[PDB]
């Protein structure tokens, strides 16, 4: 949520960083993150988000204990393609101006 707010502070027309940080009261961290993420994958703005999937390929070996699946820390796929949650290419029709930066 904090990363999303820092990014969205410079693309929103009206809300500043403090205004977005204030949204904590009327919602949750997950819900506010979902809102800002949906705002960053609209027609006006498109910022790809790094994502990952579960991994299940193991090379067989005799062992005593149980085995499980783990997420892949890196955001690339088994076939080398990048994995992104919203869009594959950055296309934003504005400039990032926040607090004079």
């Amino acid at each position: 949520f904090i990363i999303a707010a820092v990014i969205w502070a410079g693309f929103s027309a009206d809300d500043s960083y403090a205004d977005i940080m204030r949204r904590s009261a009327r919602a949750s961290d997950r819900q506010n993150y979902d809102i800002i993420k949906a705002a960053l994958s609209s027609r006006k703005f498109k910022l790809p988000r790094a994502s990952t999937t579960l991994f299940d390929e193991n090379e067989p070996v005799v062992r005593r204990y149980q085995i499980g699946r783990v997420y892949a820390p890196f955001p690339v796929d088994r076939y080398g393609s990048p994995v992104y949650s919203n869009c594959t290419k950055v296309e934003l029709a504005s400039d990032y101006n926040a607090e004079g930066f």
Binding site: D34, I35, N86, T88
Partner: protein
């Protein structure tokens, strides 16, 4: 057809309409940039037309759009209690109004009140009943159930509440003006527009079958008029006229877009200009 429309329908319908409009825009854009060559049009569309980036659609192929349409349709109109938390549904506080209806009212639905005193037949633009007995002046003979809007033309031996040629109410009712003998015939023609749109009926036929093959026990293929009448009849009573418009826009946009992705022809204006 059995279906239960929930309270959360407008939120799903907004996303569905946005997805359909994006698909139509991509289809037309790729249709203008196709140069004749080794690859056929469908191969060209499969490679680039499918790519659309929104939360909840995870594919650069038309199959992803098809699955998204299926999931949203099942969440909104089907009986199973399903909601897709992965789309941009959290920020649906405000909903853009959908385009106004343009479907001509050719077969308008009415209900004879009681007593079997009138026999009903239909025409291209007009209705007419035969009185089987004496009738008093100023009583109800028929009333519409499917809302219409437009002008009234060629009314005979009856009266409707219209001023300046325009009907004042979305549910007009016809009442006799003079006590009339048995075998008299009262008529009323309307140049009005019923619920739903008119363009894209060819795509509707091949999309309703597509989305009926999946939900094989829930949806039966049939014409657009009966589909829309049943959708309107299944709407909850406690719903505004603004949300019902979005729900009924998505309910028709889904089949026409499903059929449009099969036959790579153009797209209707109401689907595209949402």
């Amino acid at each position: 057809m059995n279906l239960e429309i929930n309270n959360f329908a407008p939120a799903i319908s907004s996303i569905g309409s946005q997805l359909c409009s994006l698909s139509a825009q991509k289809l037309l854009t790729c249709r203008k940039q196709y140069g004749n060559g080794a690859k056929s049009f469908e191969e060209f569309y499969a490679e680039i037309g499918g790519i659309i980036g929104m939360m909840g659609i995870n594919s650069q192929t038309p199959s992803g759009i098809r699955e998204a349409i299926y999931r949203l349709y099942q969440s909104a109109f089907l009986f199973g209690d399903i909601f897709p938390e992965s789309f941009g549904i959290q920020n649906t506080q405000n909903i853009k109004p959908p385009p106004g209806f343009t479907a001509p009212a050719k077969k308008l639905e009415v209900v004879l009140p009681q007593g079997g005193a009138f026999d009903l037949i239909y025409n291209n633009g007009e209705i007419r009943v035969t009185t089987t007995r004496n009738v008093q002046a100023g009583d109800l003979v028929c009333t519409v159930t499917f809302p219409i809007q437009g002008s009234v033309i060629a009314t005979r031996n009856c009266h409707v509440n219209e001023i300046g040629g325009q009907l004042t109410t979305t549910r007009p009712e016809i009442i006799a003006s003079v006590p009339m003998p048995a075998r008299t015939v009262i008529v009323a023609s309307f140049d009005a527009i019923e619920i739903g749109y008119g363009e894209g009926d060819d795509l509707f036929a091949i999309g309703i079958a597509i989305l009926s093959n999946r939900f094989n026990g829930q949806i039966t293929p049939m014409s657009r008029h009966n589909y829309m009448t049943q959708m309107f009849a299944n709407l909850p009573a406690n719903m505004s006229e603004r949300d019902s418009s979005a729900v009924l826009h998505f309910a028709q946009a889904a089949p026409v877009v499903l059929g449009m992705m099969e036959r790579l022809t153009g797209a209707p204006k109401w689907v595209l200009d949402y």
